[PDB]
Design a binder for this molecule. Structure first.
Ligand SMILES: OC[C@H]1O[C@@](CO)(OC[C@@]2(O)O[C@H](CO)[C@@H](O)[C@@H]2O)[C@@H](O)[C@@H]1O
Ligand SMILES: OC[C@H]1O[C@@](CO)(OC[C@@]2(O)O[C@H](CO)[C@@H](O)[C@@H]2O)[C@@H](O)[C@@H]1O
Ligand code: FRU
Ligand code: FRU
Ligand code: FRU
Ligand code: FRU
Ligand code: NA
Ligand code: NA
Lengths: 605, 605
């Protein structure tokens, strides 16, 4: 007959169930992930100039790269039924295919992938590097992006600069930039490539190259344009993790206030691989997903000089973001009226980067997802009170101007928001509002109405009184609640953090191994702001997207924290206000939009 | 019963015979070749410091490198029963293993092979080069030289210098040299490597490197220390072929008057790949085996500056020589009392570099041989008459001093002779002498006694009168003669050449395809010399070694010409004086030593 899963009945040890039986249990409907199996780093994204279609890529099942297309930046169509567009086992990549990026109009006017071809394993920053384990090779797709055919020749970058003792040398990221062109006297619209890694006994680095010939064959090395001492940190480690022991997945792009701009301010996103001391061999224990703003100067060699940094996503399991310029002329942008954008997809590892021992993987028959596509832009925060909170150095914002008479500053930071078409589609269900209210005493106050399924967007503003500052206040929402389970998301002033408490999230965690229930946290400063003569603590503007087990928490256009919320009971759908009674908090009207949408309309599962 | 070969009966079309049936027909007994099958370039030679044994290597059956040892530099023992000590099919060399050389005391004090690992074919100077087709990789033998184990890592030299459009990039030749050390301020006894090839639209070259680390991992590029314009030539092309379109098998070593000397004069041997115009794609039509003397200077970068050049062997099929320093402390040198030597083995291709269409290869079941080991040294020619013959520039000798009163000069050139232990062993048979005589009229004059087998050394001096100069004289010997066959070897003044006429050598060439009968030739100048007051044309001092089908012609300690003489009839063993009647010629007593010896005493075949 069939395998019988009834989510009103208590879970077994989930490891005892048949393979595939929990395929739908925690599976999102509005996120990019393959038809089944494991997803790794995103990469390979490009806009096809001939069609305007946006292609997304990701590592799949540890055997190369799979891909999908989108004509709206909301929904996707698989290429090759989800099967890889390039796989290991060639002359240059006999052991593995790691991340690569695409020159959309490359050799013969075709999408041209420059990627890390792997010949020797293991590879880790903590151990000696095997010579030639990572090279960079070319492949070209002449069939619309379903198959990237390896050029029948050796790698175009056959290793690091002479005698460099690299920790890593991978994830080539191709990009154009007119500011670099002027500084370096490059031909206009030269392609640059950064390769990510570092050097033993020195620290993490991005290795910079430029196209030497129009055939993409030779790549002139321009030095370690950005490097940091081993396990150093931006500021004192508060706002942007650590530079740690190795850089991965370096992206480079340039922004203004609306989106992507070639002449704009220059940013990079990187993963950093961290560790406690002493180092455990071959173990990266901390996977930080950072963004960094910087100025670019030259003294013989070009240099990127960070002036602020933060997290692109604060989630423990968030890492390895890959993004791409998406021009206004693309199919999605033409329909939505968007200007040029930089769209970034963060990876949410499904199994704690392969440390989640005993998770029911064969039952689920999939592992991991990408997060919602995110638009990156320069965000300005006006009318901020010029005080110590605003003026802190080594943080994730900087003062760009002053008004002495008003007593204020204008702050600059990285804007992070859900890509506009995806956001509209997430909100396309049916909506209802809960009335605003002030809470002063301790407890959870049920919503009058809660969603009946685990697929929703909750939006709300939280306004705090002056005395909340430095207090023991905790305020937010309890979600996915029933008598058996609950998840609490709250702001906490004591350490200026958004917290996701997962201690009670999953009844399955009580009966099964490998179901992480540890707290998640990200730093967020609410500044003192001036609005029509009166000073107040900045409003907390919250968006929670729950897509079955995938939780993404956005705040104030500049913050994201994402995690797994693997609730079991069909019942666990209630929402409540939460406040710990330390001070007062005023909640606006809360909007709940239920159902999301189907990001994979041509799949049945 | 058996396949019936009777060498008194006329040959069939040899291609019709059973496989292996002609295994012994033309097979040498005193030369280095594998137990069966094809031999290519020699390479890999080294003296094992722990044992004093000299190892020889050669490409075998187009699938890697085979090896043998010798404790006397006369006889050899196979390693692995003739099976390869290293074969293609690894990560770095999936398609082929080309030449390599050995640092005898390398990694872990073991013989360390640096060799060309091949990943893409075809490779030829005349066509576009496939990127990464040739890299240089390391292997180490920990079992006495029977197996060279590939290091489990990528190549240590993963391609040519940045953006160089090489014609070829192979045959790494490791060597030490104190003169380079001083010029470059290298650590004492630094290992150098030259790699051979050239650049498209520029010409042939040797790429020079030095050891950067004691682990042999990194090789610092020191430039094209020697290069020549495409298809240029030493002098006007008379004495040293052409530099042609590509250099192969570059060896570098240093000599004095006795043998090898680290502080001596610097020499290189190279193969050059030539062609008529227009170029036929993928065809090298001329394979020149050159030696070159040069001085080494520095102006920022080091440079080798040729001051004379010639052929190491004039044979059309002679090519690809590999040689090695053999110290006085070796097993062979200890027994013979030799000083440090440089021993070179020339390749004699068996099939015109794979152009010999229809040769009975499967019948023979072997292809090619190495030539006799040769000692190289600086040779001086005293008491030469200071005239235009001696003073010619762009030749294979140079004046090193003058005696104005005597009217003479002392010349310098490369000495080429059979290695001393091999020579003694070749002469170990039974000897007889033919009386000297003067010949004035035309014809062939039979020896009173000729050898009864096709295994002998014939030595003789030919003295010419003053009028021979510029005349139509031809004088020498007819060998391997009967009513059906003959081979004539003679000196000819009209173009100062030794000629081997093979028009009548092989009755099998009349019934079978692919049995070359074209003439062979090498230039040799006999100078005017002064000996006790009287001026005479220099004596022609000739040594002919016939080892079944392998003919090597030596003259005057400075000349060698080698070829195939594939006579059929058992009868074809007679020797005669030869003279064409143009002038007079005085032959000394001719010594004939018959039988040679068995260079492979632990083989039965
Ligand atoms: O899967 C390869 C791909 O992932 C990244 C970032 O997640 O590398 C991570 C990692 O696990 O790869 C090796 C394992 O061999 C190890 O050093 C790292 O910790 C990215 O850089 C790669 O392209
Ligand atoms: O067999 C490889 C070995 O031989 C040499 C010299 O004889 O190369 C000769 C040659 O035939 O190799 C390639 C064929 O792929 C072609 O370009 C040459 O003409 C030597 O350099 C190699 O190590
Ligand atoms: O830069 C990171 C590297 O630095 C070290 O301290 C020394 O190599 C290692 O722990 C690590 O591999
Ligand atoms: O925190 C930024 C978030 O704020 C919103 O604009 C709220 O409507 C969302 O679209 C965005 O993701
Ligand atoms: O240097 C040799 C090379 O030079 C050329 O003329 C141009 O590349 C070719 O015939 C040959 O490949
Ligand atoms: O041409 C040089 C030859 O001359 C000899 O010394 C003659 O006895 C040989 O040993 C040598 O090969
Ligand atoms: Na993370
Ligand atoms: Na030749």
């Amino acid at each position: 007959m069939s395998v019988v899963i009834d989510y009103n009945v208590a879970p077994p040890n989930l490891s005892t169930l048949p393979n595939g039986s929990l395929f739908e249990t925690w599976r999102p409907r509005a996120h990019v992930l393959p038809p089944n199996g494991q997803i790794g780093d995103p990469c390979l994204h490009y806009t096809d100039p001939a069609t305007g279609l946006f292609h997304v890529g990701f590592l799949h099942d540890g055997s190369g790269i799979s891909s999908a297309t989108t004509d709206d930046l909301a929904t996707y169509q698989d290429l090759n039924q989800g099967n890889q567009v390039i796989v290991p086992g060639g002359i240059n990549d006999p052991v593995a295919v790691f991340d690569g990026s695409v020159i959309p109009n490359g050799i013969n006017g075709l999408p041209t992938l420059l990627y890390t071809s792997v010949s020797y394993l293991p590879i880790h920053w903590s151990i000696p590097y095997t010579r030639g384990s990572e090279t960079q090779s070319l492949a070209v797709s002449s069939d619309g992006g379903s198959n990237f055919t390896k050029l029948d020749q050796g790698p175009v970058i056959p290793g690091p600069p002479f005698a460099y003792n690299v920790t890593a040398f991978r994830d080539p990221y191709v990009f154009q930039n007119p500011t670099l062109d002027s500084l370096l006297h490059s031909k206009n619209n030269t392609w640059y490539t950064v390769i990510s890694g570092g050097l033993h006994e020195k620290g993490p680095a991005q290795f910079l190259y430029r196209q030497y010939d129009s055939d993409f064959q030779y790549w002139e090395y321009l030095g370690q344009w950005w490097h940091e001492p081993t396990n150093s940190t931006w500021g004192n480690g508060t706002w942007a993790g650590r530079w740690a022991f190795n850089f991965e997945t370096g992206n480079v792009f340039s922004l203004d206030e609306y989106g992507y701009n070639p002449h704009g301010q220059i940013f990079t996103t990187i993963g950093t691989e961290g560790s406690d001391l002493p180092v455990v061999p071959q173990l990266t224990s901390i996977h930080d997903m950072l963004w960094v703003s910087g100025t670019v100067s030259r003294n013989g060699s070009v240099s990127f000089n960070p002036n602020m940094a933060g997290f692109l996503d604060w989630g423990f399991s968030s890492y390895a973001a890959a993004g791409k310029v998406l021009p206004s002329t693309s199919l999605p942008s033409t329909k939505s009226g968007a200007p040029d954008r930089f769209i970034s997809y963060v990876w949410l590892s499904g199994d704690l980067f392969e440390q989640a021992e005993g998770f029911p993987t064969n039952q689920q028959n999939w592992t991991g997802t990408l997060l919602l596509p995110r638009e990156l832009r320069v965000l300005y925060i006006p009318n901020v009170v010029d005080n110590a909170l605003a003026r802190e150095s080594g943080a994730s914002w900087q003062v760009v101007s002053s008004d002495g008479s008003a007593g204020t500053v204008e702050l600059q930071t990285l804007g992070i928001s859900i890509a506009r078409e995806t956001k509209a589609a997430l909100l396309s269900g049916t909506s209802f509002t809960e009335s605003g209210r002030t809470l002063n005493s301790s407890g959870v106050v049920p919503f009058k109405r809660s969603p009946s399924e685990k697929f929703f967007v909750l939006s709300a503003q939280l306004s705090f009184p002056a005395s909340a500052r430095g207090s023991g206040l905790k305020s937010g929402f309890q979600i996915l609640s029933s008598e058996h389970e609950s998840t609490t998301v709250y702001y906490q002033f004591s350490n200026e953090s958004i917290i996701v408490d997962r201690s009670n999230t999953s009844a399955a965690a009580r009966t099964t191994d490998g179901i992480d229930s540890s707290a998640e946290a990200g730093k967020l400063r609410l500044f003192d702001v001036l609005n029509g003569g009166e000073q107040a603590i900045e409003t907390l503007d919250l968006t929670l997207v729950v897509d079955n087990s995938v939780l993404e928490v956005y705040a104030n256009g500049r913050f994201a924290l994402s995690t797994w919320v693997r609730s079991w009971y069909a019942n666990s759908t209630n929402i409540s206000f939460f406040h710990n009674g330390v001070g007062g908090v005023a909640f606006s009207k809360v909007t709940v939009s239920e159902g999301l949408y189907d990001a994979w309309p041509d799949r049945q599962y």
